[PDB]
Design a protein around this ligand. Sequence first.
Ligand code: 6BE
Length: 303
Amino acid sequence: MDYDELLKYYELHETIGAKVKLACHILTGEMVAIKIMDKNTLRIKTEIEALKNLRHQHICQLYHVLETANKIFMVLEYCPGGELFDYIISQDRLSEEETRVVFRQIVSAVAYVHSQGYAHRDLKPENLLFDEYHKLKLIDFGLCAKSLAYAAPELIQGKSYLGSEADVWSMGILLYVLMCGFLPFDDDNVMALYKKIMRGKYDVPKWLSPSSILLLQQMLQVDPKKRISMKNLLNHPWIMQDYNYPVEWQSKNPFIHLDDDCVTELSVHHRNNRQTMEDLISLWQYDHLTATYLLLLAKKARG
Ligand SMILES: CC(C)COc1cnccc1-c1cnn(-c2ccc(N3CCN(C)CC3)cc2)c1
């Protein structure tokens, strides 16, 4: 009963990870990742609402939501490059230059999330995946609003906070891990870790440049009001080094504009006219029609 409707649209492959299954969209032949959630074993509603309203080059795209009596299925953008967490480990640590390449992509996604009125609240390398073009995609918006090693001091303490300030702190931890390959605050004991985060003191390895050190101090402030704002992160001197242009955070992936080639390709599978087809896609119901349209756009982007 749980997989009946899903099997009308997707050919299921292997379980890779909520359970995560790889699959192929029948109509287009495009690969997808399907996140499966048991309604009676559980956050799902939070992530769905957010993802329906977020659409960006650095956010893992939601294509289709299906619901049964026991399950909720979320069909998502295929990211075969795997986790940034596994990537950092495989490389030991990244140079400042490669860190900047990946960090500017994280800044792009996070700034857009804040521009839409949300805060991610769970930024960490396990939540960033590489796609086939080696571009980062931000995942898991289950804790989003309108892990302990990455949490801001105020968030752990159960104090009132601004999600944007907690995200900037988490991005500071990410920046450190990218250039060092280990956490700034770490301990086997949870209370000793909590003490280390509240104190805000960390080791500064010899390989970090003066500019990297200054940017880390600006993000890693225990006092959230002393943290750099997202707007100042966009054109920060360290961020601009070797680029000379601020981070492009605006979305290149629209809700309004439709691609004529993909509307044409999609229309052959339906008994409706052109205008009816465009009006239906524009409703963004995250049904099979939404999935088909967005997967045709990903197929076109490959060519
Ligand atoms: C299981 C976790 C990574 C969580 O995954 C997710 C969580 N929330 C949203 C999206 C995803 C998601 C999106 N794409 N993939 C993914 C796609 C393909 C592959 N392999 C890599 C190696 N290759 C040779 C075979 C295919 C691995 C992972 C997972």
